[PDB]
Amino acid sequence: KGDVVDLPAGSTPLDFAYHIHSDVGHRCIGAKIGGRIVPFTYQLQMGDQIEIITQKQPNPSRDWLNPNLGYVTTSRGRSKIHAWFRKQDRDKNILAGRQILDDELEHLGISLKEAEKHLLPRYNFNDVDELLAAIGGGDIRLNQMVNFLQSQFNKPSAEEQDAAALK
Amino acid sequence: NIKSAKKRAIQSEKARKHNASRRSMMRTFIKKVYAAIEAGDKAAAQKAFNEMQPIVDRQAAKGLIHKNKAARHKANLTAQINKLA
Amino acid sequence: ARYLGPKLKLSRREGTDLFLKSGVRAIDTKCKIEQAPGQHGARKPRLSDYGVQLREKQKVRRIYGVLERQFRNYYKEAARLKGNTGENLLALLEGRLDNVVYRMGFGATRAEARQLVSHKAIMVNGRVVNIASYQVSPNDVVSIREKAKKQSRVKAALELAEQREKPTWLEVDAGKMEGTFKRKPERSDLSADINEHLIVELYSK
Amino acid sequence: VTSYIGGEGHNLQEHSVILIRGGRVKDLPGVRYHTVRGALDCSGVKDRKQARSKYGVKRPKA
RNA sequence: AAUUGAAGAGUUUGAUCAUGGCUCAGAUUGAACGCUGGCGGCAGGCCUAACACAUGCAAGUCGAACGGUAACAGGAAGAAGCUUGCUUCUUUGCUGACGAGUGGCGGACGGGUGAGUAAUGUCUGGGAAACUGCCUGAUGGAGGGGGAUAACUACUGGAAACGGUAGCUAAUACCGCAUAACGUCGCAAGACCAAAGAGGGGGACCUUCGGGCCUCUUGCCAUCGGAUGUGCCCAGAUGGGAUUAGCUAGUAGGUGGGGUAACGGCUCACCUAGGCGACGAUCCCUAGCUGGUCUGAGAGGAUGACCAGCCACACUGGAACUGAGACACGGUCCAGACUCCUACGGGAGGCAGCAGUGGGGAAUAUUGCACAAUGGGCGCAAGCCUGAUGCAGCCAUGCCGCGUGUAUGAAGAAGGCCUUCGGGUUGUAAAGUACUUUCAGCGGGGAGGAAGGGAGUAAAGUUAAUACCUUUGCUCAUUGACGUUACCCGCAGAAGAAGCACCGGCUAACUCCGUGCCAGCAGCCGCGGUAAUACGGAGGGUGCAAGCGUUAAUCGGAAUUACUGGG
RNA sequence: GCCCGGAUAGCUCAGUCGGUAGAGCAGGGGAUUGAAAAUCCCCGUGUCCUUGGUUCGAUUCCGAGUCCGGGCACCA
């Protein structure tokens, strides 16, 4: 279409689609060059014409090659790939953590909304969905979070228990 | 598909028209004959037979119908116009 | 392909001599034969039965230098062939071209005779044969082409191989460097202290 | 299914796909397939000059 | 001359002998994986998603069937640069031939896959109610006309695809009439039905002077044949399950109408009330079948990938057309899902063809070359097409062969390791020395796979004819993708070429050190609790070798499903 | 690509406001035995990702880059 672009040596044509746009690379399904079709593994060279082809949404340019590192380099889109991957899986996992977290909400601090208030100003907390999107995704590591709910201070006797602990 | 054999399709398709056309002819005369059999007009039913005879035989020779088939029609039908008496 | 290693060591393990340093010197002390293949080797071993059948298979193939795989081939061919499969076996192993060459003694050893055949230096009926595993038919007249002929080593090797108890199931012009093969050796005339059935039964397992 | 992890110092962390081969452990109840160490995400054992084919370590030469 | 063929061990126990499961030794593979990696030959290579698919190619051919000629090469004929013969621009199918079009043949072959199928299939062996293009034997005919239509013109719809209307023209296209038969029907008498021309030559003669006419090769029509192919039929065999026992109403049979190449519920109407089922029907699951492959002494057991026969499918469901033949892989029509063009009205498409892409997976290659060889289509042929096929590349994936020096050589070197620290061992291995140089790397040579086919030529056959053409000999020019071939000759130089498992018993092979029921091993027994031959390293050993192990899978041992062969 | 949060000794984790980094659980040693168990006695484990600046005080402040995790565009 008329747009050259530098790409680190060892680069794969898949990176190239991601470079233009993740979805161009996500649903991507093969690309030709110089009027010849090539496997994703073929490394890109000296500013050759690109003849990429796309699809719909499903992404697996390296779902079976990502960690394998069997040609599908540069952390660029693959970074974006884990994103996508997680996003879906984490969504259903939101649901899982959803239920789990709710019982624990009523476990220590009791009441959902009450416990959700303490999480309102929490860790880059974002919307209430991100909350379960985090725990349901496991990227918040619990127990710490639990005690944070009951981070209540008082010491109207516990101060002397802190003396009894010393006794 | 787009492969010089689509002509075959066209050519064969054209034949369908003509082929079915002449085939229609054959069966319709025969119908009048079977129709003639309900009537009992054995003389003119025979006439109808005398009409189809050249027509059915001919189509057999043209290849539109395997000869043996013609033999069938004329056979059993002639048997019917004999028994109609 | 070929063991190509400390050849005298194999004689140490298998038992006595394996003709791997033929002629000029017998297994003369500076050989440490007896038993001492390795460190502990000098110590007393029992060698359970299977071990015996093994050592025989090993020793034999060691003499002919052949590797187990192709050796297995020799066994199967020895099997389908009629009569004493143990004997047909020795007939086959002994008829080997490079082995026939050591029999004419052109090569001081079976090994030296092997590279010899591998250098296309030798022929049969006037046909250069490079195959080490070449099998020799009866009445063949294996020769030595002029280009590779008369190369010191071979002739002195002949006078050397004369020390043996002479092959007797063939023919040779010796001085003219030109082997020949009569009939395949009768079991009686071929060592005969190298038990064979131990191998037949070995693969029988 | 559960899977045994062969040799000294594995490096796997929760995820990481790994090839799986047969062979019961005969020690651990209900465990059946050895993780093909040295393949894919499962890096071979560190220092294995002997019997390195198993355990995926390559020549010690390097 | 045409099989000479059969191994056991560990493990229950304080110990035994039984019984007996688990486990191992073996061979095997379309294999993957780790580690490693010299060459060649012959083989094999998507087993999972019958998942979707960009590009190219995989099926065209005949001008010797036809109207024609849009290109192209020339001729012939002309305005004409006019070197008066150096050739510019032009008209004409006149020949070589040749886009598009009609038409014959082909496309139903070849090639892929194994989804479906538990029997409409297959194998084995029987059978009668059949058809059969192309090839081929015989018998005869090949008479005489008509209407068209495509291309091509004009106009015109549509963005495209693809048409619409009017006109004109042809034929081995089609239709009729005639003409018939050892052909059809028919008791017979009778009734009735076919087609087509080309290309080469040519003397006499007639030439509405295109030609008729003689001849020739082929093509054309019919019938009876033969071969081949194909459809059909019956019996027997062809997985598992009874925790599937009743199943079926075109179902079982008859009669008659129809129908197919053909018998037949193959399909209808009418009548009978049956048919199948414990020798397993029906229902459910699974599966392409076989020749064969693997294993096994054998009987069996597992499987049926490459190769070969058959069957079924060809984007999913289905229908029919044309034809000898398909209910059609690269044909048609409809539907569906999915892709893509759009001017939103409508359209286009099917890699389970070869390569190739994505995806699935533990995993399986190059969008390579050529028509030279075989075979295939067509054409009389020359020829053209031929991802069939031949070859080539790829990958140790297997089987096979060879090579990674050879002989010699003790100070039994060094260094490494154990030491009962004398020594032993590594180990003739190294070094050195002399030797030969396979195959790698290099330089020149050089088959076979090539048979035919071509032009000329002679004779023979035919014939009115040294014609033409056919058949058969001689002549030159020839025809190889692989292919800087095979193989050989010569070249310099040890030079360019070794790993992997294992060493407690099973089972070939030991010690030192480190670690201490830990870290780790394991197929079974079990090892490790501060002296491990069993864990990790080392040295040395054993095995195997461009392979070695691991796992999966079959069989074997297992006479633990026993028929041979047990209780 | 740009912007922002997360690495606190073996696991879980504590404070992470310029302050001299704490435990829970485990884990090892000791008496005990052939070794454990039970019993009894005793303790520990840090670079606060890494880097360097302001630094008595930085581990949180500062920017850099690491890996973790979120957000939005980039459609040849």
Side-chain angles (χ1 to χ4, degrees), chain A residues 1-56 58 60 67 70 77 83 96-97 109 115 121 133-134 136-138 156 158 163-165, chain B, chain C, chain D:
Chain A
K1 301 287 284 186
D3 184 7
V4 302
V5 61
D6 290 319
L7 278 188
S11 177
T12 64
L14 280 173
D15 312 335
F16 188 77
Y18 292 118
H19 166 281
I20 299 172
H21 188 175
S22 68
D23 68 345
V24 184
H26 281 165
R27 63 173 187 291
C28 188
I29 53 177
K32 302 192 303 295
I33 53 168
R36 185 176 62 268
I37 199 168
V38 299
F40 292 154
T41 187
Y42 179 76
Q43 86 304 330
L44 304 176
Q45 65 284 14
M46 299 303 291
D48 181 25
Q49 292 73 26
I50 292 302
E51 313 173 327
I52 56 86
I53 304 178
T54 62
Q55 187 190 358
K56 314 302 296 180
Chain B
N1 196 337
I2 298 171
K3 179 178 303 302
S4 292
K6 69 185 71 177
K7 174 186 75 175
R8 166 61 62 179
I10 302 173
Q11 201 155 9
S12 65
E13 186 291 318
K14 174 182 173 298
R16 180 175 72 81
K17 296 181 180 302
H18 174 286
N19 206 42
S21 177
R22 305 313 293 273
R23 175 180 295 168
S24 176
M25 175 184 289
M26 183 183 81
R27 278 180 296 191
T28 53
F29 280 115
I30 307 173
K31 291 307 305 178
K32 287 162 56 187
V33 184
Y34 279 118
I37 291 179
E38 285 188 356
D41 189 348
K42 63 192 194 70
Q46 180 54 279
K47 178 178 183 297
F49 176 88
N50 295 301
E51 296 311 310
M52 71 161 291
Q53 178 154 17
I55 211 65
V56 54
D57 284 339
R58 181 175 299 95
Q59 287 315 84
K62 296 300 185 59
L64 179 151
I65 285 301
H66 190 288
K67 183 187 66 62
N68 205 40
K69 176 180 167 64
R72 288 183 48 256
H73 287 305
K74 288 161 58 184
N76 47 43
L77 187 55
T78 294
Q80 288 312 83
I81 61 178
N82 277 142
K83 295 172 62 183
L84 170 66
Chain C
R2 297 169 59 272
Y3 171 61
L4 52 81
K7 288 178 288 297
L8 187 61
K9 178 181 296 300
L10 309 183
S11 76
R12 302 175 73 168
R13 180 62 69 176
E14 303 306 314
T16 58
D17 175 67
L18 286 171
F19 299 95
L20 305 184
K21 303 290 285 186
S22 74
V24 187
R25 279 179 53 177
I27 307 73
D28 56 352
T29 309
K30 310 174 191 67
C31 307
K32 296 287 295 182
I33 184 169
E34 303 89 10
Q35 70 164 29
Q39 173 206 331
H40 196 75
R43 291 274 291 180
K44 183 179 66 180
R46 188 55 53 191
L47 188 67
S48 184
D49 174 66
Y50 168 68
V52 164
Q53 304 189 337
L54 171 68
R55 286 305 159 195
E56 289 312 303
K57 184 186 73 67
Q58 285 311 90
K59 184 191 70 177
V60 175
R61 52 167 290 195
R62 295 293 180 68
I63 285 178
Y64 299 78
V66 294
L67 289 182
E68 190 285 326
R69 176 50 55 194
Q70 178 164 16
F71 182 83
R72 191 178 185 66
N73 170 349
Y74 297 124
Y75 175 70
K76 289 181 298 302
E77 186 56 33
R80 61 174 291 272
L81 281 169
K82 304 300 182 60
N84 189 337
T85 297
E87 183 171 12
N88 300 330
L89 172 64
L90 291 175
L92 300 182
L93 280 166
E94 200 57 13
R96 293 174 55 65
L97 181 68
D98 56 337
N99 191 50
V100 175
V101 162
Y102 174 67
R103 280 311 169 191
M104 297 314 99
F106 293 119
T109 63
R110 304 183 186 293
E112 168 184 352
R114 184 167 184 173
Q115 70 159 12
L116 167 66
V117 178
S118 170
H119 302 310
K120 288 178 300 183
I122 315 307
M123 75 194 92
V124 60
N125 301 118
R127 288 177 168 293
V128 53
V129 182
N130 180 46
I131 296 308
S133 174
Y134 185 71
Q135 189 41 265
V136 182
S137 307
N139 295 277
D140 298 344
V141 292
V142 46
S143 180
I144 295 80
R145 59 179 188 177
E146 309 308 307
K147 304 171 187 298
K149 185 180 180 179
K150 73 185 67 179
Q151 274 325 79
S152 313
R153 186 185 65 192
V154 184
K155 295 180 295 181
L158 175 56
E159 77 172 316
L160 186 69
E162 288 305 308
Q163 306 185 317
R164 294 181 308 168
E165 307 185 323
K166 324 296 181 172
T168 316
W169 55 80
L170 41 94
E171 202 51 32
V172 61
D173 266 352
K176 287 178 61 186
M177 300 179 269
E178 191 176 338
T180 297
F181 183 77
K182 189 187 299 176
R183 64 175 190 299
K184 46 185 182 179
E186 302 186 329
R187 176 66 186 72
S188 62
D189 283 334
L190 46 93
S191 298
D193 69 322
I194 48 176
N195 190 310
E196 101 291 15
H197 79 73
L198 292 168
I199 299 181
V200 177
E201 63 179 359
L202 180 151
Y203 288 128
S204 294
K205 170 189 288 187
Chain D
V1 303
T2 66
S3 67
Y4 184 78
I5 308 172
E8 297 298 334
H10 76 82
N11 70 324
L12 258 66
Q13 38 178 33
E14 203 290 313
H15 293 298
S16 303
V17 298
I18 44 179
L19 193 49
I20 299 301
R21 71 186 183 71
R24 176 185 55 185
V25 294
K26 180 55 172 59
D27 192 63
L28 303 170
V31 186
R32 304 176 173 183
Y33 324 119
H34 295 84
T35 61
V36 184
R37 189 173 187 68
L40 279 74
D41 305 340
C42 186
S43 63
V45 181
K46 189 61 181 178
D47 308 331
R48 282 286 294 172
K49 287 61 185 177
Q50 175 172 27
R52 57 176 169 297
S53 279
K54 301 171 187 176
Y55 300 98
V57 181
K58 58 187 64 188
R59 292 309 287 287
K61 180 56 185 178

